[model samples]
Target: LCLSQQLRMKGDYVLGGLFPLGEAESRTRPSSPVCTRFSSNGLLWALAMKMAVEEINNKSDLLPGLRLGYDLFDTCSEPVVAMKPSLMFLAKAGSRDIAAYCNYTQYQPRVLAVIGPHSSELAMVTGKFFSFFLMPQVSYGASMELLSARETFPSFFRTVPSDRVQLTAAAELLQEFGWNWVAALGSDDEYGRQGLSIFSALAAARGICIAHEGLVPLPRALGKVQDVLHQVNQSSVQVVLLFASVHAAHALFNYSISSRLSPKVWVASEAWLTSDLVMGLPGMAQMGTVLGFLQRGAQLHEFPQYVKTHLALATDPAFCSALGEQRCPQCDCITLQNVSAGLNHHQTFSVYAAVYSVAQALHNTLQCNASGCPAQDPVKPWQLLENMYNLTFHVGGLPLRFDSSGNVDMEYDLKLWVWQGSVPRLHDVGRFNGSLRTERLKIRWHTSDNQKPVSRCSRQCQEGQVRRVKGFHSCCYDCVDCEAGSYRQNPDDIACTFCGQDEWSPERSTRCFR
Candidate 1:
């Protein structure tokens, strides 16, 4: 009598997808999990998966006589929601049942690969299982640095780049702007905490200083929002490096906006950068200029149309699959009428890439020719993995390949969000991919803000000035000119002192001499 929702279509080679169809009710109800938030963005991803499969199927030369299919499930943003179905994709029963077996030489399963489990927590949990069975798992969003450990998650592949690359690019952005001192905050989790740790290390490597660190949790979000905000309010820096997960970022902005939070230049991670939930907030423009390390280089020409027309279709495929209902069951589709408020989500490009990667992997697996793929060839999960490991292809003009660490090399466009009266408009300002393009760099300083805002300890002391420690950080200091007979040898010195008993110095001199 118990059944779960899954989108399905019968095919010779089927792939599975895990999408955060809704924000999971965070484990309060133990018996059966609940989903409190309906995710339209996740619906976009699922639709992208469907579009990708159909695109591959429609390619006459690509698969020839074959058709690629999918069985997608609503993860509700929870990993456990897909556990049973994930196993179902693994089991081979001629019927809807799992087969238990043990053999080394040959193994074939119902599903050849997986497309997602977008969050790092879900990927970290499910990828290990997929790797154990040698099933290919291609993630569209999870980017924790830990997944780069190929020994641990050998079968796990990502369309998204790892956090290490993200952190490196973010550090480069800060270095380019000379934002030597800034506050950092991340949602408390693998993606957030680990990201901050890596970002901290990168900042240190570049001689950047973190003025404050705010690590808040998902469960304790609203409770800790004010505390975290107060910490940011008190910080001396004018720039904030926020690496929060989607929901945590939403909570922060939600409460902060209600309180009329002070505006500061904000640097956003990919997770919350393009999120409509946060950006659509009524007072978000008051948050000041937000710079995002935008994932770029994909032009999904067909996706926006699919999103536009899905509701008009007889019965939405996502609706059927999400409910795991019988074909054309009376299911109401999730309304996304205004979802396309003009934000171009680049993650859909990743979803398209992932689906095509699996198709190409299958193409390589069967050695398909002009006539068609040989029906004699069996779809093996392991074979798919080998092809995936060796796969190289291009999408939307970007060449795609998995590096030694099982991650894709990515490029980012530095995007800026500035207020247009009451509305905040996101603009493509410069880039982080190639030498930080300063030519295109534009900020809304209201003309009074033409120069980059100061987020450092203090101004640098000149030749005649000696820095005296005035605050906790070495970067912040009071400059005092040397009167006579005393001097400071280097700019890094905290004070000026007598050089030697025999040495003499002029007034305001940086060096003492005989």
Candidate 2:
């Protein structure tokens, strides 16, 4: 019997996954060497998916004896590498097109849903493959605003908040700290460009002005990177917001240290907020304190042990050969223990939730009774897709559900990075759902100055005065007293209002007097 037929007979559910195992290609030089490899971050999410599937299959009440299988692929963080595996998941093994299966009497899509393609750029390309058939594609890391457009990516969904919300949080953080004069740096990719644009717009609307903008290309060009750092070093801006990937961050940080860039309050976007890639850089603490937002992470007690055992048992020479030397060196499994520490917990939860979502949707479609799913009737992929709407399940006693747009509740934990001896440590300062709340006592800065950094175009206007338009930036204006006939009622009033004809103004024109 064919493998597909046998799987159909046994009722094994298949899910496809894609994650970057190495560096992505640079836009300027498409052929540029991608030097990094084997993301433990990506590996964590993949393992999370495995754990979910195993737990569901083990529970008699969940799928009721049905087995869940997965076919995971590494995208190498490039679109070209992603295309083939994506097509393979959607197409029949012997055929090039999905429609070719119409001629075959017994054919079924091996995969019901897909879980990744971590980069937003790669997600866009791979997402298209799933959208043609309305296959559910849940991304654990991709957060670009372009993916939120339903018309473009109808089936595309994400566990992380979109860049719009992330930028909003960043803007509010700056406002709360009163850092109006800020420098912005970003990668040259879609994720960075869109993030920079969105954040600048939102910050400008909230009376924040960007002093300068810098773009860092991936794979570290020493000369170009130095130029970018020089602009930041020369700027008077006290806060620097970074909207780049891990690779770009590494390049930028390396330049900052080498040039001995003066310390400034650094703000990190969600991309590399929790990444150890940048945190491990020499003189990371010398860059001053960094503030960033993180998704709420779930605690999985069994995960650490699972990773330890999984790595130890994966010892076959043939299997080890597949990972290559750069990705998986001999006895490299010891590094798996750091998965829980080095990677973002939110990603782990997202992967865990994604698997449960697929399982729940499958269960709803099959409508499994006590007797188990009907062997005669098979569940279709489109049917599973339709059932994904309003799907809710529980993972680790926490509610895992999606809204109409395929997003979970938007919540974030505000964290700060501080130096402890020579090592940098992250502390959960507080949180932000709508308001910025931090445990001020627990927060520490790189310096003992203790005073908050100031970055505004103008200081607050005193009472009985109005702000007069002076320059291009709104916050750059001057504070002036109200005109003779006008009265200013508030200290922060932008302009003065004329007093009533019957009323007269007092000495300072603080208010109209009868």
Query: If scored against the real structure, what TM-score would every candidate get?
Result: 0.76, 0.73
- What is candidate 2's local distance difference test score? 0.71
Candidate with best TM-score: 1
lDDT of 2 by residue, 1-514 (tens): 0111111112366788886644443357655234344456666676677788778877877778688788766677667667767777776654777654333234456677888777777887877767767677888777777777778787877876777776788888878777767788889877788878787778778888776776888893366887877776675677888888888888888877876677788888876887778878877777787888887767677777777666665654555554443322211433444555654364677678777777887887788865476664656566776777687777778776677777776678887886768767778987878777767778666666776767666647666677765322444656667666878776664767788988898545977877
Each model's C-alpha lDDT?
Answer: 0.72, 0.71
Q: Against the true structure, whose lDDT is highest?
A: 1
Candidate 1 TM-score, C-alpha based: 0.76
Per candidate, the number of residue pairs that clash is: 6, 0
Residue 49 CA error for candidate 2 (Å)? 3.0
Residue-level lDDT tens digits of model 1 in 120-220 = 77788888777778888889888778888888988888887777766787788788777877888888876687887788778777878676777876855
lDDT over C-alpha atoms for residue 23 of model 1: 72
Give the per-residue Cα lDDT of candidate 2 at 154.
79
